[PDB]
């Protein structure tokens, strides 16, 4: 290849960098365009369009995007020749001759190899630092390399810089404008009051207005979601700060389909109105999904902290309490929930006239390509009707959850959504016991294991008004069976395997601790099936 | 009880406490005479008194720590202070108003007599009303009631001899929690970086040593000589140094019950058993007979450059100045005991790297007997910066690992910390692997480690990678880790064991590698029993 002779007396270059992580090509690629001292860098549900620019003659290195409403934003950083740069041999790439030079960035080991071979400056990574000359290779930490694949001469000269820099930012400012342009975030509460005020669901429910239930502590809104979520990554956020109540609570967020004749939105009505889960204790309105009735799909566990922000007065040596606790999940999985208009709700269980101040949103990120698959709710014992009258989900004591459900079509390599928690808040109950779950599917066993939280102490200033023992332990730093005060539970992903058309049986045994002194122990259990 | 003490100088009332209509053990006596009151318990400990002083419209709280400290708390009271009228009632034959006021969320009730010229309460922290103090009902439920009230022919003055030192009722409630509580300091904000640091061949206690390239630092410390009837944690802080990357971390002691243990592994990792994989023999990561693989207490992950990349600007954060990470290890007792080595890894390539606090505290429980904790086998790459092979064996392998009991033993489990590994879209680090478990080749468990809740911990990542479709980094799901958070263990339950041999295995179904890249598991397991 004789690239020298190629490019001699071009009116300027092409060149085509292609990168790759440890021998690995990645996708997609860059052509930088370089004509006089311009350069111009390009590669190759509305997304920006992004460049990147470089100045030699005035020593400027541009970002410019043009976002989908259309406005131009940019940022200009001044550089030097060879700042934080300090020499590291030579090289040869594409048969050209280059200086290596090594800086390092946030850890990173960064080594740019340039060439004054042909009269033409340009850098694919300005922001690792710009040598005076032509990048033909960065190399990050030995591994990760974007190097010219081909240069090639363009017949014509011209003006690269783009006609406007619209609104001029700082970098962070900048970045962090193109990096969330692309995202779709749907508000659906901010710091609503969560309470016991024996509020009632009205008669008529219109889109967009948050209605309280089952006594307060349920707070319901029908939102618009994307039509589709394919291509998206999904996750909920809250942020929570009691208003009053000073306890750990029992936190959810659901989404209640409507697919069949009833919904939870008819239980939380009636509760005694829909299908119940009929146990040798008697009978449980609205945990299972059955042929009729939907169980609301459960996206978040979460517990309060004791008294998050209300607190916050309370002095204990050594802590510094938080004035709010946030929590993140992704719930990708739930996208065939997660699209039109759905029916929204989170609770926080209590008994306080204030109670907590609750925010929620989801995010959906754009993602490769990402098929929505199904889901479909099967259970849920979350007491989320505790303060209209509720009964405790207490049946595990002498029973197994029993749900069957129907696929019209096989499923390959589905899987349960499965959120646990014990409870029972007393040294012989379940919250602070370990107890195993035991889940069968079509008469048999698929797995068993025990749900154990031990990393409570961690969250310790987030539980201004947590008792503190003689001890010397506080009640949030107790291991509890899957949870602990301020953080979110994560689901198990449980394998099912393939599945055949047609009805199937799910149970699940919980050998749940005896009732003392009138308390009861009690599981919250949810389920739904990602197929 | 009226008649009787009229023209007494003073009472002495028993009170009982009853919870769901259970009453409780053993008793308050409060001794009133004049307006002062003395309460004390009726038959290590610190020694816990109440005073009130109704002259001086003053509560106090008052002890003599096990060390023969005196420590004492006042607290000025308003009569009446959140009392609400709530009607009659009668208590041991004497007419009581009921009072109500609300406290931290809970209903208190307190019944309280002028029928007879006494002023006291069990509970001055509810609220003092102006007479004596028959009966305090929270939340309608937990009861502290009069049971006796005895007349005294004498006068006394009640208020101790010596206030000892002074404190606010805070200072005091932190004292007195705290007396009983074994704190072991071990690390201080100690460096933790990769500088070719190298074992010693002399090993002082209660020194700190560096070691494995210098990514791993050791001490060997005095524990208690039992851990008998604690609960036991461990409580991490971090920040880096310098490092901008999320690592992984690691806390660990070396048993040396048998001929060779990691602190051998740790001078040279060749000096020790292998594992024998089809692929290739990896030193010191099972136990043997003759050779004991570390036992892990903690698996946690640093986030991206916390304290030192404070400086990052990205709207809506706010960084965290360090990270904490407190675990419960009480099922490592037997572990815990004596003169221990204890270690802390956070695997990196940086000049300065990381700085790691450490301490163990271990805090009274009621009767706990130390069981058994045996390590059976640690994947972790402690030795990753002095040429430890990643552990990529499971992608034609699984781990397997022979031990033998002595006794059988009942409800054996496995204490078991599984994170996957392999940074890039095809990697374990980022896709769903299920981990089988199998003992005496049966399958135990089948489950899929895996974390969703990454982007709760935004504010401890201040150097994680902003994507351009809005994510960052640390947001994303992974293999049972979040880049500042601890990975908390199974427990795996394995059933009742015979004495005498036994297998374990572990399989994973690794990812492939793509080109250098490679994925792997760091799973460590001891068994409890």
Not at 429 to 456: A, H, M
Not at 465 to 493: A, I, K, Q
């Amino acid at each position: 290849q004789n690239l020298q002779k190629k490019v001699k007396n071009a009116k300027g270059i092409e060149v085509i960098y292609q990168s790759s992580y440890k021998g690995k090509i990645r996708p997609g690629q860059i052509k930088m365009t370089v004509s006089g001292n311009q350069v111009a860098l390009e590669s190759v549900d509305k997304q920006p369009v992004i460049k990147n620019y470089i100045d030699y003659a005035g020593r400027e290195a541009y970002k410019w995007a043009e976002l989908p409403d259309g406005k131009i934003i940019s940022a200009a950083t001044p550089f030097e020749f060879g700042k934080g740069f300090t020499p590291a041999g030579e090289g040869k790439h594409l048969g050209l001759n280059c200086k290596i030079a090594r800086t390092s960035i946030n850890s990173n080991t960064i080594e740019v190899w340039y060439t004054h071979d042909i009269p033409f400056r340009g850098t694919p990574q300005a922001n690792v630092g710009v040598p005076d000359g032509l990048v033909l290779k960065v190399v990050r930490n030995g591994d990760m390399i974007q190097e010219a694949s081909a240069i090639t001469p363009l017949k014509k000269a011209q003006a690269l810089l783009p006609d406007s820099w619209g609104e001029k930012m700082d970098a962070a400012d900048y970045q962090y404008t193109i990096n969330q342009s692309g995202v779709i975030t749907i508000p659906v509460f901010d710091q609503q009051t969560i309470c016991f005020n024996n509020a009632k669901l009205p008669d008529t429910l219109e889109d967009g207005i948050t209605y309280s239930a089952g006594g307060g502590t349920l707070i319901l809104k029908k939102v618009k979601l994307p039509e589709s979520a394919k291509n998206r990554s999904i996750f909920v956020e809250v942020a929570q700060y009691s208003d009053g109540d000073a306890y750990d609570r029992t936190g959810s967020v659901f989404v209640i389909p409507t697919d069949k004749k009833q919904s939870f939105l008819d239980a939380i009505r009636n509760l005694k109105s829909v299908p119940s889960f009929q146990a040798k204790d008697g009978n449980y309105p609205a945990l299972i999904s059955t042929d009729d009735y939907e169980a609301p799909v459960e996206l978040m566990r979460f517990f309060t902290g004791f008294g998050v922000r209300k607190f916050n007065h309370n002095k204990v040596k050594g802590q510094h309490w938080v004035d709010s606790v946030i929590y993140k999940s992704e719930v990708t999985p739930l996208a065939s929930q997660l699209q039109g208009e759905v029916w929204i709700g989170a609770y926080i269980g209590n008994w306080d006239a204030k109670g907590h101040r609750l925010s929620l949103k989801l995010k959906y990120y754009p993602d490769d390509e990402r098929r929505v698959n199904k889901a479909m709710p099967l259970f849920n014992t979350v007491n989320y009707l505790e303060q209209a009258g509720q009964a405790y989900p207490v049946f595990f004591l002498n029973d197994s959850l029993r749900v069957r459900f129907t696929l019209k079509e096989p499923a390959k390599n589905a899987r349960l959504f499965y959120l646990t928690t014990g409870h029972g808040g007393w040294g012989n109950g379940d919250e602070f016991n370990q107890k195993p779950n035991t889940v069968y599917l079509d008469g048999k066993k698929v797995i068993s294991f025990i749900p154990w939280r031990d990393d409570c102490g961690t969250y310790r200033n987030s539980n201004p008004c947590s008792g503190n023992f003689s001890n010397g332990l506080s009640s949030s730093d107790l291991s509890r069976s899957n949870w602990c005060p301020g953080t979110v539970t994560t689901p198990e992903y449980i394998y099912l395997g393939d599945l055949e058309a047609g009805e199937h049986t799910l149970s699940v045994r919980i050998p749940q601790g005896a009732p003392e002194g009138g308390s009861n122990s009690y599981w919250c259990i949810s389920g739904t099936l990602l197929y």
